[PDB]
Amino acid sequence: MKRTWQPNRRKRAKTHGFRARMRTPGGRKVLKRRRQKGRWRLTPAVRK
Amino acid sequence: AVKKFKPYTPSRRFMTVADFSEITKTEPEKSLVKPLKKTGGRNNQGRITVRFRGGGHKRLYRIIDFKRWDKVGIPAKVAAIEYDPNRSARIALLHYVDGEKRYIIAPDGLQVGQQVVAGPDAPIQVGNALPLRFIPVGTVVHAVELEPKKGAKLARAAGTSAQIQGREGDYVILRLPSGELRKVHGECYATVGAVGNADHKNIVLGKAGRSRWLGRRPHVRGAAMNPVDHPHGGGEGRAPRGRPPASPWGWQTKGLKTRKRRKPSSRFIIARRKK
RNA sequence: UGGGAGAGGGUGGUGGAAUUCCCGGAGUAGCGGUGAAAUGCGCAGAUACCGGGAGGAACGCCGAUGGCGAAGGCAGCCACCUGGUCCACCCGUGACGCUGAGGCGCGAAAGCGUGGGGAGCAAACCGGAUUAGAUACCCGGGUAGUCCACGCCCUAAACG
RNA sequence: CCGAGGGUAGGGCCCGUGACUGGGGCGAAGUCGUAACAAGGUAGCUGUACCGGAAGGUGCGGCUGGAU
RNA sequence: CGCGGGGUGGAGCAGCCUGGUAGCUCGUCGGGCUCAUAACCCGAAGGUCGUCGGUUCAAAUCCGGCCCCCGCAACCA
RNA sequence: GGGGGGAACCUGGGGAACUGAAACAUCUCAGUACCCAGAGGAGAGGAAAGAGAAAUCGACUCCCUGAGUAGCGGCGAGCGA
RNA sequence: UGGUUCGUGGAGCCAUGGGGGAAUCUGGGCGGACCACCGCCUAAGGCUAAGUACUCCGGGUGACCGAUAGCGCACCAGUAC
RNA sequence: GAGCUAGCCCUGGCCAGGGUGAAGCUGGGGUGAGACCCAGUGGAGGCCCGAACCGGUGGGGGAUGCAAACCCCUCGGAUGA
RNA sequence: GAAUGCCGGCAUGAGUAACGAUAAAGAGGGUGAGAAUCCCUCUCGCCGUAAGCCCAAGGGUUCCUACGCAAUGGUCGUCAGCGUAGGGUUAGGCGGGACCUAAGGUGAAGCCGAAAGGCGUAGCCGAAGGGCAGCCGGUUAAUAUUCCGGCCCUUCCCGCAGGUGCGAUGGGGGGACGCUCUAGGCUAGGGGGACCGGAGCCAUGGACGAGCCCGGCCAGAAGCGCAGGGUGGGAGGUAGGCAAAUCCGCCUCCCAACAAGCUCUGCGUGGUGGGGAAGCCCGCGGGUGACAACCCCCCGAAGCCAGGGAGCCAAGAAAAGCCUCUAAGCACAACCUGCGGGAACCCGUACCGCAAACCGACACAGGUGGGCGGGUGCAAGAGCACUCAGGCGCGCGGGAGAACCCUCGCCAAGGAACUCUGCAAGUUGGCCCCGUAACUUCGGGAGAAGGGGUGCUCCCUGGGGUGAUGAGCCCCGGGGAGCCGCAGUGAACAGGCUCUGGCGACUGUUUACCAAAAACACAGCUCUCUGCGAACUCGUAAGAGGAGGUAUAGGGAGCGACGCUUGCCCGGUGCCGGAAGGUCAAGGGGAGGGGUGCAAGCCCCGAACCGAAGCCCCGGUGAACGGCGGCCGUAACUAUAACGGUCCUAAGGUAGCGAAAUUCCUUGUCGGGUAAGUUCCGACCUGCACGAAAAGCGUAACGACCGGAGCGCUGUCUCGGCGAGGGACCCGGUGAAAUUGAACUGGCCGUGAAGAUGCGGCCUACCCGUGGCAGGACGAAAAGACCCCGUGGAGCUUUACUGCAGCC
RNA sequence: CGAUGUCGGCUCGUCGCAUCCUGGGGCUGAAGAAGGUCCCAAGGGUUGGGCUGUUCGCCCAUUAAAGCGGCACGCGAGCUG
Ligand SMILES: [Mg+2]
Ligand SMILES: [Mg+2]
Ligand SMILES: [Mg+2]
Ligand SMILES: [Mg+2]
Ligand SMILES: [Mg+2]
Ligand SMILES: [Mg+2]
Ligand SMILES: [Mg+2]
Ligand SMILES: [Mg+2]
Ligand SMILES: [Mg+2]
Ligand SMILES: [Mg+2]
Ligand SMILES: [Mg+2]
Ligand SMILES: [Mg+2]
Ligand SMILES: [Mg+2]
Ligand SMILES: [Mg+2]
Ligand SMILES: [Mg+2]
Ligand SMILES: [Mg+2]
Ligand SMILES: [Mg+2]
Ligand SMILES: [Mg+2]
Ligand SMILES: [Mg+2]
Ligand SMILES: [Mg+2]
Ligand SMILES: [Mg+2]
Ligand SMILES: [Mg+2]
Ligand SMILES: [Mg+2]
Ligand SMILES: [Mg+2]
Ligand SMILES: [Mg+2]
Ligand SMILES: [Mg+2]
Ligand SMILES: [Mg+2]
Ligand SMILES: [Mg+2]
Ligand SMILES: [Mg+2]
Ligand SMILES: [Mg+2]
Ligand SMILES: [Mg+2]
Ligand SMILES: [Mg+2]
Ligand SMILES: [Mg+2]
Ligand SMILES: [Mg+2]
Ligand SMILES: [Mg+2]
Ligand SMILES: [Mg+2]
Ligand SMILES: [Mg+2]
Ligand SMILES: [Mg+2]
Ligand SMILES: [Mg+2]
Ligand SMILES: [Mg+2]
Ligand SMILES: [Mg+2]
Ligand SMILES: [Mg+2]
Ligand SMILES: [Mg+2]
Ligand SMILES: [Mg+2]
Ligand SMILES: [Mg+2]
Ligand SMILES: [Mg+2]
Ligand SMILES: [Mg+2]
Ligand SMILES: [Mg+2]
Ligand SMILES: [Mg+2]
Ligand SMILES: [Mg+2]
Ligand SMILES: [Mg+2]
Ligand SMILES: [Mg+2]
Ligand SMILES: [Mg+2]
Ligand SMILES: [Mg+2]
Ligand SMILES: [Mg+2]
Ligand SMILES: [Mg+2]
Ligand SMILES: [Mg+2]
Ligand SMILES: [Mg+2]
Ligand SMILES: [Mg+2]
Ligand SMILES: [Mg+2]
Ligand SMILES: [Mg+2]
Ligand SMILES: [Mg+2]
Ligand SMILES: [Mg+2]
Ligand SMILES: [Mg+2]
Ligand SMILES: [Mg+2]
Ligand SMILES: [Mg+2]
Ligand SMILES: [Mg+2]
Ligand SMILES: [Mg+2]
Ligand SMILES: [Mg+2]
Ligand SMILES: [Mg+2]
Ligand SMILES: [Mg+2]
Ligand SMILES: [Mg+2]
Ligand SMILES: [Mg+2]
Ligand SMILES: [Mg+2]
Ligand SMILES: [Mg+2]
Ligand SMILES: [Mg+2]
Ligand SMILES: [Mg+2]
Ligand SMILES: [Mg+2]
Ligand SMILES: [Mg+2]
Ligand SMILES: [Mg+2]
Ligand SMILES: [Mg+2]
Ligand SMILES: [Mg+2]
Ligand SMILES: [Mg+2]
Ligand SMILES: [Mg+2]
Ligand SMILES: [Mg+2]
Ligand SMILES: [Mg+2]
Ligand SMILES: [Mg+2]
Ligand SMILES: [Mg+2]
Ligand SMILES: [Mg+2]
Ligand SMILES: [Mg+2]
Numbered sequence A: 001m002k003r004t005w006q007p008n009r010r011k012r013a014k015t016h017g018f019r020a021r022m023r024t025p026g027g028r029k030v031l032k033r034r035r036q037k038g039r040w041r042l043t044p045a046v047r048k
Numbered sequence B: 001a002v003k004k005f006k007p008y009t010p011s012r013r014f015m016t017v018a019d020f021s022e023i024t025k026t027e028p029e030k031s032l033v034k035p036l037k038k039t040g041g042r043n044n045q046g047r048i049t050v051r052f053r054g055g056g057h058k059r060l061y062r063i064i065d066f067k068r069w070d071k072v073g074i075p076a077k078v079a080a081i082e083y084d085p086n087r088s089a090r091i092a093l094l095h096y097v098d099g100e101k102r103y104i105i106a107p108d109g110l111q112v113g114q115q116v117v118a119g120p121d122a123p124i125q126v127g128n129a130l131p132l133r134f135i136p137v138g139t140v141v142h143a144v145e146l147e148p149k150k151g152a153k154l155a156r157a158a159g160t161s162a163q164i165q166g167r168e169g170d171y172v173i174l175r176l177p178s179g180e181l182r183k184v185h186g187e188c189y190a191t192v193g194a195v196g197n198a199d200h201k202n203i204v205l206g207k208a209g210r211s212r213w214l215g216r217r218p219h220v221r222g223a224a225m226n227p228v229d230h231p232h233g234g235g236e237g238r239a240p241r242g243r244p245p246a247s248p249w250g251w252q253t254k255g256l257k258t259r260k261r262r263k264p265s266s267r268f269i270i271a272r273r274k275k
Numbered sequence C: 001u002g003g004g005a006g007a008g009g010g011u012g013g014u015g016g017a018a019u020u021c022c023c024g025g026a027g028u029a030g031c032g033g034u035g036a037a038a039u040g041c042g043c044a045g046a047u048a049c050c051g052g053g054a055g056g057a058a059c060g061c062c063g064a065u066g067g068c069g070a071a072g073g074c075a076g077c078c079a080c081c082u083g084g085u086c087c088a089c090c091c092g093u094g095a096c097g098c099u100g101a102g103g104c105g106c107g108a109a110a111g112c113g114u115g116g117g118g119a120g121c122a123a124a125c126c127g128g129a130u131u132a133g134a135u136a137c138c139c140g141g142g143u144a145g146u147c148c149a150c151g152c153c154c155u156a157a158a159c160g
Numbered sequence D: 001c002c003g004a005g006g007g008u009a010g011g012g013c014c015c016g017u018g019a020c021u022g023g024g025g026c027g028a029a030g031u032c033g034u035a036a037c038a039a040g041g042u043a044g045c046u047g048u049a050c051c052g053g054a055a056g057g058u059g060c061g062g063c064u065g066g067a068u
Numbered sequence E: 001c002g003c004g005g006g007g008u009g010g011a012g013c014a015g016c017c018u019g020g021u022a023g024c025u026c027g028u029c030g031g032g033c034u035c036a037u038a039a040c041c042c043g044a045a046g047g048u049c050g051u052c053g054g055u056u057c058a059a060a061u062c063c064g065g066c067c068c069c070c071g072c073a074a075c076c077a
Numbered sequence F: 001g002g003g004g005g006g007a008a009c010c011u012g013g014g015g016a017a018c019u020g021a022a023a024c025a026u027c028u029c030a031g032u033a034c035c036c037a038g039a040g041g042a043g044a045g046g047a048a049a050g051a052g053a054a055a056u057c058g059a060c061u062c063c064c065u066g067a068g069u070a071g072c073g074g075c076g077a078g079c080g081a
Numbered sequence G: 001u002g003g004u005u006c007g008u009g010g011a012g013c014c015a016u017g018g019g020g021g022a023a024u025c026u027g028g029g030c031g032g033a034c035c036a037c038c039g040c041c042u043a044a045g046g047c048u049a050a051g052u053a054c055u056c057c058g059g060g061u062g063a064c065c066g067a068u069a070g071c072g073c074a075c076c077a078g079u080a081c
Numbered sequence H: 001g002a003g004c005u006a007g008c009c010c011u012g013g014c015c016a017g018g019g020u021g022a023a024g025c026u027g028g029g030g031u032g033a034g035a036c037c038c039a040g041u042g043g044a045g046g047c048c049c050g051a052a053c054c055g056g057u058g059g060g061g062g063a064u065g066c067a068a069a070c071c072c073c074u075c076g077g078a079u080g081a
Numbered sequence I: 001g002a003a004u005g006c007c008g009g010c011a012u013g014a015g016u017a018a019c020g021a022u023a024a025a026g027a028g029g030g031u032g033a034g035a036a037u038c039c040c041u042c043u044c045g046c047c048g049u050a051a052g053c054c055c056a057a058g059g060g061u062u063c064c065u066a067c068g069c070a071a072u073g074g075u076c077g078u079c080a081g082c083g084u085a086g087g088g089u090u091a092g093g094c095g096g097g098a099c100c101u102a103a104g105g106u107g108a109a110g111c112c113g114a115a116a117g118g119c120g121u122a123g124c125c126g127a128a129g130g131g132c133a134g135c136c137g138g139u140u141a142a143u144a145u146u147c148c149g150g151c152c153c154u155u156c157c158c159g160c161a162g163g164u165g166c167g168a169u170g171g172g173g174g175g176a177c178g179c180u181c182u183a184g185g186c187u188a189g190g191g192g193g194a195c196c197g198g199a200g201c202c203a204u205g206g207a208c209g210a211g212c213c214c215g216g217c218c219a220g221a222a223g224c225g226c227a228g229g230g231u232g233g234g235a236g237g238u239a240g241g242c243a244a245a246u247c248c249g250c251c252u253c254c255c256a257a258c259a260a261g262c263u264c265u266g267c268g269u270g271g272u273g274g275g276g277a278a279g280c281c282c283g284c285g286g287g288u289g290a291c292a293a294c295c296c297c298c299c300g301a302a303g304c305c306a307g308g309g310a311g312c313c314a315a316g317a318a319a320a321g322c323c324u325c326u327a328a329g330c331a332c333a334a335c336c337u338g339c340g341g342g343a344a345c346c347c348g349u350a351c352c353g354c355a356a357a358c359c360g361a362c363a364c365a366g367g368u369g370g371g372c373g374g375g376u377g378c379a380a381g382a383g384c385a386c387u388c389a390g391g392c393g394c395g396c397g398g399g400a401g402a403a404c405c406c407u408c409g410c411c412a413a414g415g416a417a418c419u420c421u422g423c424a425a426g427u428u429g430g431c432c433c434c435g436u437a438a439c440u441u442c443g444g445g446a447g448a449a450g451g452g453g454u455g456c457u458c459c460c461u462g463g464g465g466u467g468a469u470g471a472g473c474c475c476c477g478g479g480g481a482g483c484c485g486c487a488g489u490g491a492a493c494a495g496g497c498u499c500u501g502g503c504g505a506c507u508g509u510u511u512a513c514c515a516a517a518a519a520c521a522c523a524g525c526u527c528u529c530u531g532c533g534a535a536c537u538c539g540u541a542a543g544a545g546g547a548g549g550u551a552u553a554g555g556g557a558g559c560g561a562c563g564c565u566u567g568c569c570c571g572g573u574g575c576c577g578g579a580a581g582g583u584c585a586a587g588g589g590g591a592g593g594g595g596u597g598c599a600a601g602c603c604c605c606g607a608a609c610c611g612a613a614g615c616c617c618c619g620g621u622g623a624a625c626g627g628c629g630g631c632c633g634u635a636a637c638u639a640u641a642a643c644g645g646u647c648c649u650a651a652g653g654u655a656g657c658g659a660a661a662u663u664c665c666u667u668g669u670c671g672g673g674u675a676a677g678u679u680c681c682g683a684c685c686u687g688c689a690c691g692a693a694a695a696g697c698g699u700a701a702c703g704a705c706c707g708g709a710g711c712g713c714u715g716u717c718u719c720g721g722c723g724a725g726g727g728a729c730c731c732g733g734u735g736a737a738a739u740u741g742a743a744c745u746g747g748c749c750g751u752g753a754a755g756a757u758g759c760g761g762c763c764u765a766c767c768c769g770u771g772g773c774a775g776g777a778c779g780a781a782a783a784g785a786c787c788c789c790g791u792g793g794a795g796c797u798u799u800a801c802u803g804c805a806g807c808c
Numbered sequence J: 001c002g003a004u005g006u007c008g009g010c011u012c013g014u015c016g017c018a019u020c021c022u023g024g025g026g027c028u029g030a031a032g033a034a035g036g037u038c039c040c041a042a043g044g045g046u047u048g049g050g051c052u053g054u055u056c057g058c059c060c061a062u063u064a065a066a067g068c069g070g071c072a073c074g075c076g077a078g079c080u081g
């Protein structure tokens, strides 16, 4: 049956992606936290 | 003048459509339509704001002259009578004699070929448009402006009618289709005769399906809910209401007036609506 | 062919008296009602008077034992459409006449259906009287209906 | 092949019958009130509608087979 | 099994709660009106206030126990 | 000239509730947590329209004392110069 | 209404969203409602390092741990997953 | 966080084959003119049987399963909401 | 030493269950150390609207090759989607971009918001929509509509020649649109051919035959024909299309029209370029056949001409590209036509792709949009049976042939007796014909019910299409004689039926993952709010929705098609109406009283009166919140009471229903059905406790809803029996888990915290396994969900308390 | 209460005897047959249906009789709901 992940290169890059995040003081904090963290991949790896 | 159906499905036992005798022309004029953005309740916030709308047939919006004082004294030919989804009325295409073409709404008794014209000099014959103070007392009129040069607000639905009961000063007294008696300013134009399609009220929609075609979703009763959703809801059993029957959002719905008390339009109304 | 009077029918407009409601003036202690009282209405200014506006139903005198129609029935005035009946002339046809089982059409009032309209009046209903009791005759409120458009119902002391 | 009749299945008419129910006719004297006969104590009768425990009451319209 | 109202003339109710005093209508009885009955008028009688028990100066009244009579609740299993 | 970063530290503009009160609403947690803006190696404050009773001190900040004092509190819990 | 310990309390001082709304040293505010005296100070413009805080960095030292301890990681970690 | 699910907005796509035979049009009939009747045509419908598609009715298996909702026989819709 | 403790490791269960589809496997040869599992060949089975091919998502080296097997592979493995290494993806034309806009998003103006931010006209972005020029064949181990061959085409730049008022980010046209049905002519695709091409074969009785088997096409500029679409032409005036206009629009005159001319597209032929089977000769492809043939006929679309036609209401996107019109500007320019030459960028292009490469932790019986999806008999069909190309036999086997389970088949005699119920499983089943009841909204019921025919041979006869009127092929019939079997929809895909009751009218919708219903929704009815900057909703605001709607409309509420109907109570709550009155806050007012100073003066309390909502007060209001009675007596049999008396209420349940989805006593009483009926139906009415928009009483048709009954037929049953294959058992390979204080773990009778393998006393009892059955180990699993407890917690209600938005 | 799964039915039994039948006996108001009561006795037997979830019960047709009970109202790691 139709489970929850039905993946979409566009929808992923439009939702979780970079130019989502720097639009919003949500997401500007998020990358601020991850760059504070150490993290290698701020946005998800989306595959163009 | 209404068309019935033989009961060859159970929905066609009751179902009525309007006759469309009086349509003349079956696709509308291309320079004068522009697309109705459907909403389905949804505001710019995208929440529903009024409920249970959605799912309509797609539609094209017809631009209407609701002013007619653009074109004062410039007479015009009734080209055609067309369907419009967006109104209870039908519509009239006006071939003006300078060949601007415009839609207006379609008064009763109007026929194709005859001649309409707007202004204070206009004759009192059906469909001509005049400021109100130049119209005799007692006549029946429609498409009535409310404040002048703001374009027509009153008596636009099908079969509707306002009667001039008389004048006072600059102002002139109308019997509105509610039966509100209300002063209108005289300089507000209106448009003589009463609106066509007067058997719009005698449609029987037959079935569930036509309301979905008109975009009206299922309306779901407040005693069918549970009481987070609505005041009435729940109760083991069916419920009588148990309380003064009421909105979703709290306020009652048998008898609570909610016209604003301090409205400056209150100084221009004679009589409340009746019945 | 000429002429005649008639509420004959239908459609569309129009006038006026009066009731009720609303607006304003002025004015006070009861109005209304009955056989007599009461419910009620009234000081939150009623009734009575004056003016103005909206609203609907019915057309006083003329008007009668009269007129019109096959019947039901028809009454302000204006028109348009239209039917039956009458008289004279004795022009034309030439017995084409009569009734009429069925049929088809009309068919008061109450009632019914969709939408109007609703001033008065008014079954059901409520109150107050009367009465042993009063679901009634009396009185005060008062919904359908009474009016218009369309479609049904087709009964009667439809009687002369 | 036809075919008397048997069998299966569904209809039409007619008779008897059926707990209970609506009303009628009848049955010397039971109970409740009095609508019609006089202007019957509110003229009556009637078509229809509503109401009522009963006749009957009222509304709307008609008739006089209603007197004064 | 539980809880809480009632019992007063022949019928229906009132009087208690702060004690005294038994009221209303109908019924019944005697007379009047009528030819006569019912209605109408005048007048009249009829009461351990369900009971045993005290309390108190005194109990239909106040408090227990019993007798009828009315109704109510008897739930999660 | 500004934008945009910076583990905390700073200031301003907003600003909860569990919890304590053995319940809870004034209180308390607390102007704490967090959100936002904005400085800088510091920020803030800063030269008296002040303190408070000696006719006395002499801008601000920070530590110790003052001091759990004065006081504030459903005078409860607790807060606290 | 907020800040001060000040929860309206005798409620002053400081800041002020609303309304009223002057004077210039014979002129104003304060000394805990108010009046008097006696004193303090000069509002409604701004600037100013030093002492104070923190520790992503570098060095020094531990009656700090010694691979389940010590930062989550002593190792290709904020990775594999 | 609406890449599941719910609702809506914008844009394309999909629904084999068969069955009943509404309005309407044409002709005949009818009356004074209409209503209306008959025949042919006509193919309307939240119409019928019935696959793909969308479901999930009853029953049996499955129960550390093939599967954190399956499979089988059976069934409802299938031009519409 | 314990915390269902935390991390790590190893046990028990256990060599047990399982090894992930009951589509299926056998043999021979080869390679190898090793083979049921890899390669090849033959025989056999399975899908074949798929389990076969092309895309789109998504996956991101998995594609191809060489070298391998430690691990992944549910066994083995020389094999692989696994390890190592190397190769591998070519575009002016396919798709995206340098073109367009829709929802939406962003957003100079401008509006709003303590901050962050939120709206927002123009514009931009936004595609699987619009626009746009590539078809056929070959080659490589892997890519090709991309490289090559043939044949065509588009934009840009330049150069010539000619023609024209050229010119756009502006005006206009057009692009431009729904659903259902459908006509004509094509093609795709398929069928037949006694004609053309060909390697071959007479097998076992017969057959040298008009024998069998195979194949008989693709694409193609210009021109031409066929079938369509699109399309009126001139003059004049003209205020409108926000400047201009020769364009469009409007008015007038004239011209011909199921036309015609102009233009565009599809299809056919078309110079020409390609392909070309069966077989058998070698080895997962290649040569020949052959110089291939490349004809005719029949069926025929949903696809094309296309923007076609006809009907219907619910009335069916925007912008650009394209044509035209002019203004600034230039009118050596600038465009328009024809040719010639040059220029032509970036991304993807492998491969799986209904799956072992994507989403389900897995090589998982699940889920995933579009296109092709052949043949034959089945009436038709994408259905079902068997098959063509093509692809698989599902990554453990071999054996035996117990109980018992799943799944399938059959049965005597009875036919629901089983049973909560015919649950389940049977009979009927398709088509054609005869025939079909009460009832009713006239449509229906209804395929009602119930029967009769259905194969094959021969003969005769009718209609239609293609043709040519013909032949032949195809479709659709009618009649007669005869043949065989138990049976002729001969296998596969196909309703069991009725009567009657309850509920909802109906079709639909719903608790993904235990409830598909009587629940929700529904057209329909009513009440109420709402005069436009509407009422209402979202937001502090701005602003939106409402709605670019205007009372025949929009919000709220409740019944819920339809027929007949919907009575009484305004006492209390609610809502509506009421300028009087009473109560009432800030404020106005300042009678007096107080504080201080020597004083003017400063400061503080402060009564009468004025004073709004709201409440109190006076009315109305039931398709508003709601409610609609006791007790006693009475009729010439008894029995009951149509009467009367009395108390309370604001008013005392009308019609219609009634032991019902409601009826405790209760299986109420009577009747029907049954042999028997706590159910069902028809009645009675003593309604604990129906009853009129939480509607009342009915109601044809509909329902996988719920009771009742009957016919038909059955393994449901007395009452079981046999057979089948998939496990189970045995052998070889791989091999878990819940659980587990430790164990050497018997019964009866006592006993103990009550129900003992363990204590006591008797009785029985050699050690250890395997297939089974399940009474116990108060078996496992889950710190009870029912109950209580804690001054735990969370939804919800309200005339609880207090507050807040909102409104007055 | 860190679970002792509950009524009824199906399947499977087993036990007590205060005995439904059958065996033996006493008394009888026991003539005989058939009955009533009491004693001993558990070897074995004790039917099929209609109604309802039924335990029980009512009824139909038979019988020799259509028994009362326990076993966690025996029995869900056997089944049903
Ligand atoms: Mg990096
Ligand atoms: Mg890195
Ligand atoms: Mg447009
Ligand atoms: Mg938006
Ligand atoms: Mg947004
Ligand atoms: Mg219209
Ligand atoms: Mg609910
Ligand atoms: Mg919610
Ligand atoms: Mg919500
Ligand atoms: Mg609520
Ligand atoms: Mg409620
Ligand atoms: Mg609920
Ligand atoms: Mg209830
Ligand atoms: Mg007269
Ligand atoms: Mg003559
Ligand atoms: Mg009438
Ligand atoms: Mg009526
Ligand atoms: Mg009256
Ligand atoms: Mg009365
Ligand atoms: Mg009386
Ligand atoms: Mg009235
Ligand atoms: Mg009526
Ligand atoms: Mg009516
Ligand atoms: Mg009539
Ligand atoms: Mg015969
Ligand atoms: Mg016979
Ligand atoms: Mg009399
Ligand atoms: Mg009389
Ligand atoms: Mg009456
Ligand atoms: Mg008459
Ligand atoms: Mg419980
Ligand atoms: Mg409970
Ligand atoms: Mg409870
Ligand atoms: Mg910064
Ligand atoms: Mg802060
Ligand atoms: Mg607390
Ligand atoms: Mg604090
Ligand atoms: Mg500083
Ligand atoms: Mg200074
Ligand atoms: Mg504090
Ligand atoms: Mg504090
Ligand atoms: Mg304070
Ligand atoms: Mg201020
Ligand atoms: Mg100050
Ligand atoms: Mg001071
Ligand atoms: Mg001071
Ligand atoms: Mg170590
Ligand atoms: Mg660690
Ligand atoms: Mg969605
Ligand atoms: Mg979604
Ligand atoms: Mg059809
Ligand atoms: Mg259908
Ligand atoms: Mg179907
Ligand atoms: Mg179907
Ligand atoms: Mg398909
Ligand atoms: Mg569903
Ligand atoms: Mg299922
Ligand atoms: Mg099961
Ligand atoms: Mg189906
Ligand atoms: Mg455990
Ligand atoms: Mg084992
Ligand atoms: Mg085993
Ligand atoms: Mg095994
Ligand atoms: Mg397998
Ligand atoms: Mg070898
Ligand atoms: Mg096959
Ligand atoms: Mg993967
Ligand atoms: Mg790899
Ligand atoms: Mg490979
Ligand atoms: Mg290996
Ligand atoms: Mg190796
Ligand atoms: Mg292996
Ligand atoms: Mg090898
Ligand atoms: Mg590899
Ligand atoms: Mg470029
Ligand atoms: Mg925005
Ligand atoms: Mg753009
Ligand atoms: Mg595109
Ligand atoms: Mg495109
Ligand atoms: Mg392209
Ligand atoms: Mg031979
Ligand atoms: Mg061929
Ligand atoms: Mg060709
Ligand atoms: Mg212009
Ligand atoms: Mg060509
Ligand atoms: Mg070849
Ligand atoms: Mg078309
Ligand atoms: Mg544009
Ligand atoms: Mg030009
Ligand atoms: Mg060139």
Ligand SMILES: [Mg+2]
Residues within 6 Å of the ligand: I143, I144, I349
């Ligand atoms: Mg490629």
Ligand SMILES: [Mg+2]
Residues within 6 Å of the ligand: none
């Ligand atoms: Mg490829």
Ligand SMILES: [Mg+2]
Residues within 6 Å of the ligand: none
């Ligand atoms: Mg597919």
Ligand SMILES: [Mg+2]
Residues within 6 Å of the ligand: none
């Ligand atoms: Mg997988």
Ligand SMILES: [Mg+2]
Residues within 6 Å of the ligand: I363, I395
């Ligand atoms: Mg596999």
Ligand SMILES: [Mg+2]
Residues within 6 Å of the ligand: I364
């Ligand atoms: Mg799979």
Ligand SMILES: [Mg+2]
Residues within 6 Å of the ligand: none
């Ligand atoms: Mg799906």
Ligand SMILES: [Mg+2]
Residues within 6 Å of the ligand: none
């Ligand atoms: Mg699919």
Ligand SMILES: [Mg+2]
Residues within 6 Å of the ligand: none
């Ligand atoms: Mg096929």
Ligand SMILES: [Mg+2]
Residues within 6 Å of the ligand: none
């Ligand atoms: Mg055949």
Ligand SMILES: [Mg+2]
Residues within 6 Å of the ligand: none
């Ligand atoms: Mg198939």
